[PDB]
């Protein structure tokens, strides 16, 4: 029965039981957890328990601002740079899967509905030193699959209808709230299927669950010297509803595209040994020596 | 206008701050909330679900063999079968449990634990075990007459596939803390041991070795404080295809 | 939005400012308050507890010998036994007292002091002392007939192990201040002297030299203003193992 819980439950005092009838012995096979109370197992005292439960609220457990993107690029003249390089601008398809602390926390659930509070920290380093330029950056939110700019002075940066944020390095970090955007009532943290009508689509990736694109340029023309500009994107989920909890990820993540697994070479978190080994089942690992 | 002055902490980005921020999409109407089964509002709901202990965290126990304890017929009395270390903040048989993994996002914890053991021999397999919780202080008890002086349940698994050993919250402090020190008086919960109370006694056509699956959950007096990064996941590189998000 | 302007003092960190600041841990529930004995809400509670004066702050008085004044039988009358300097903001017999150490976190002070002297001879030891407080102005009185013109108590320590000399707050100003000038009219409290009112008169099997332990407390008219760093502790290095906090 659903109830409001702000503190952990009190313990009632209990006495000696010696009864022939009603049971510390439950039924595992029903899939139910043991409802055996400590009052029924040992002889207890009354404890008025004032321990709050608010820090394990799913809103508090997930509304931590976590690093989701970290991109360095050269801020310089890119007349003669490679066609792979971020030429004063990068684009980033927003995902929660590239950094494993946020990834494992969000993958504790099957479905998540949250607004995405996006914080953008920019740091700059000179590639001799003459000082750091207070550069203006543009972060433009582009939807999944939509047109992203192809150069720094692209006419896609005009943002007639795309939301752009302009921000300076000397400023506080740029901060935007992206709404809950999904075409569904929740994001699918795990998607058991293909999101395409042919059989060649990607498994596990529903583009409904992709927030969108951060297209981040430097608005400034290049300086006579080069700079390395590191953009860090932080996401805080908020107004979070979470559904269907899952086993946590035990093995190391291999990719962001899937739930592929290798494990570590030895215990802990190996394919065939998640917990580190002890010598025997009757060996106590941190036995007090007296 | 308004005379103001900036405080210390102006312009900082605390990752745990709690502020309204600018809507990137004005007048966006989010998709209507649909009822989805299994909503979690508080992580203590997950932590109260019993999940398999990896008591057989030994070498040669490979994969799924680690989630059961094989008990055999013995020819000496009062014999120790297995023991379980009890610090849920540490690595051990409790770590990859629902109570263990959520607790290791936290530092401080209070509250009783329940241990449920399911006997998985045959119907014809009979026997009695004693499951002892020893509050901390000294070494782990190795004989039965030493361990039954603590909290224990005696379990006939004749018709009864399961019992619960409540590990009651017996601590000096309101919380126990992780500090990477297993032997600390602020950390150590004590011990769970299992002994042959009688003997595993099977007939000739039952398998002579039987298995126990152990579970652990938290009770509803359980609490977790001081949220920290989990030591259970980590990276020293970028993952595969993470660069493809920039392309 | 709101038209604002920054005042002088914007962005400053005053170490005595009083502002709310960002919670590092949201929804942290602190451990429930338990009743602990001996709660102090105001440092004047400590300052009213009598504590030993180090009146015997001389050389050859080693350690614990400094916390008692040995009185002996004398063969001249009206004789001076000891005197006490009275500025609680300075170093002297009052400094390492509960009233002295807390006051030296402050600059300004008002209020009466009490001096309690415990006679620690034998039961058979008899005698009368006169404990004189002299308000400031001139030199410390050296004869008894000069010192008894000020505030005094005459104490027979025959059956009476203790008396109190109230040093009443007699000042021109509301407060007395420390300025590192002992002879200042804003600082100097005057003098406490002790004289043989009769004589320490012991029998042959009592110890012929007897000790006095002197105490000082503040009364409840006592006040302390203008909080400053204490001159009683200091460092010119980092302490041992302080580097280990960075490792």
């Amino acid at each position: 029965i659903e109830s409001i819980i702000k503190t952990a439950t009190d313990t009632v005092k209990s006495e000696i039981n010696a009864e022939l009838g009603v049971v510390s012995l439950n039924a595992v096979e029903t899939g139910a957890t043991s409802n055996t109370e400590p009052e029924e197992a040992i002889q207890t005292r009354t404890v008025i328990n004032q321990h709050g439960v608010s820090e394990t609220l799913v809103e508090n457990f997930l509304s931590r601002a976590a690093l989701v993107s970290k991109r360095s690029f050269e801020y310089k003249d890119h007349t003669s740079s490679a066609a792979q390089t971020d030429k004063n601008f990068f684009k980033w398809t927003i995902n929660t899967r590239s950094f494993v602390q946020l990834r494992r926390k969000l993958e504790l659930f099957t479905y998540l509905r949250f607004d995405a509070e996006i914080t953008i920290l920019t740091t700059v380093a000179v590639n001799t030193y003459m000082g750091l330029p207070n550069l203006t950056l543009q972060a433009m939110f582009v939807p999944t699959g939509a047109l992203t700019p192809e150069k720094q002075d692209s006419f896609h940066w005009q943002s007639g209808s795309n939301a752009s944020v302009f921000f300076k390095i000397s400023d506080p970090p740029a901060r935007m709230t992206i709404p809950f955007m999904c075409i569904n009532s929740a994001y699918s943290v795990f998607y058991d299927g293909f999101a395409g009508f042919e059989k060649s689509g990607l498994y596990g990736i529903n583009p409904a669950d992709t927030i969108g694109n951060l297209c981040v340029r430097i608005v400034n023309e290049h300086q006579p010297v080069g700079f390395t500009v590191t953009v860090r994107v932080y996401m805080k989920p908020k107004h979070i509803k979470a559904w269907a909890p899952r086993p946590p990820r035990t093995l190391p993540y291999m990719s962001i595209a899937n739930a592929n697994y290798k494990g570590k070479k030895r215990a802990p978190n190996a394919l065939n040994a998640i917990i580190g080994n002890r010598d025997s089942v009757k060996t106590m690992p941190h036995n007090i020596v007296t | 206008g308004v005379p103001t002055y900036l405080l210390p902490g102006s312009g900082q980005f605390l990752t745990t701050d709690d502020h309204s921020s600018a809507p990137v999409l004005p007048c966006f109407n989010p998709t209507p909330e649909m009822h989805i089964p299994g909503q979690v509002r508080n992580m203590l709901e997950v932590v109260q679900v019993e999940s398999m202990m990896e008591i057989n965290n030994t070498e040669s126990a490979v994969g799924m063999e680690r989630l059961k304890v094989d008990i055999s017929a013995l020819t000496d009395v009062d014999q120790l079968l297995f023991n379980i270390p009890l610090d849920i903040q540490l690595d051990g048989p409790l770590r990859n449990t629902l109570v263990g993994n959520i607790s290791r996002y936290y530092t401080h914890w209070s509250g009783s634990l329940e241990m449920t053991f399911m006997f998985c021999g045959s119907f014809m397999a009979t026997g009695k075990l004693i499951l002892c919780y020893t509050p901390p202080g000294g070494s782990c008890p190795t004989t039965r007459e030493t361990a039954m002086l603590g909290t224990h349940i005696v379990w006939d698994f004749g018709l009864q596939s399961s019992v619960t050993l409540i590990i009651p919250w017996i601590s000096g402090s309101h919380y126990r803390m992780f500090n990477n020190d297993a032997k600390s008086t602020n950390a150590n919960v004590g011990y769970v041991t299992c002994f042959m109370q009688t003997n595993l006694i099977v007939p000739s056509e039952s398998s002579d070795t039987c298995s126990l699956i152990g579970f652990i959950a938290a009770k509803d007096d359980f609490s977790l404080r001081l949220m920290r990064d989990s030591p259970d996941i980590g990276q020293i590189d970028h993952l595969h295809a993470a660069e493809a998000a920039y392309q | 939005g709101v038209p604002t302007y920054l005042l002088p003092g914007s962005g400053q960190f005053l170490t005595t400012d009083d502002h709310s600041s960002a919670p590092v841990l949201p929804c942290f529930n602190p451990t429930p308050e338990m009743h602990i004995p001996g709660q102090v809400r105001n440092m004047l509670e400590v300052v009213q507890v009598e504590s030993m004066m180090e009146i015997n702050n001389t050389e050859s008085a080693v350690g614990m010998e400094r916390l008692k004044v040995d009185i002996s039988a004398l063969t001249d009358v009206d004789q001076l036994l000891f005197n006490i300097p009275l500025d609680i903001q300075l170093d002297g017999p009052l400094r390492n007292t509960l009233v002295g150490n807390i006051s030296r976190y402050y600059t300004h002070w008002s209020g009466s002091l009490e001096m309690t002297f415990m006679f620690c001879g034998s039961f058979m030891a008899t005698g009368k002392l006169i404990l004189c407080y002299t308000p400031p102005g001139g030199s410390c009185p050296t004869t008894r007939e000069t010192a008894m013109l000020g505030t005094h108590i005459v104490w027979d320590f025959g059956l009476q192990s203790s008396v109190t000399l109230i040093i009443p707050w007699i000042s021109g100003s509301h407060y007395r201040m420390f300025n590192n000038d002992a002879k200042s009219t804003n600082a100097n409290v005057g003098y406490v002297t002790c004289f043989m009112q009769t004589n320490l008169i012991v029998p042959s099997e009592s110890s012929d030299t007897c000790s006095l332990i002197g105490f000082i407390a503040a009364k409840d008219d006592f006040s302390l203003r203008l909080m400053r760093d204490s001159p009683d502790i200091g460092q010119i290095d980092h302490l041992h193992a302080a580097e280990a906090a960075y490792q």
Binding site: G31 | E45, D220 | P26
Partner: peptide
Amino acid sequence: INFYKDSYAASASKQDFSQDPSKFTEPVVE
């Protein structure tokens, strides 16, 4: 405090203390 016109813009809602752990601990019918 929220001076934005969208309700999703607001700060986090750390106020929902309703629990139903029995949908995970007792998902049985009898």
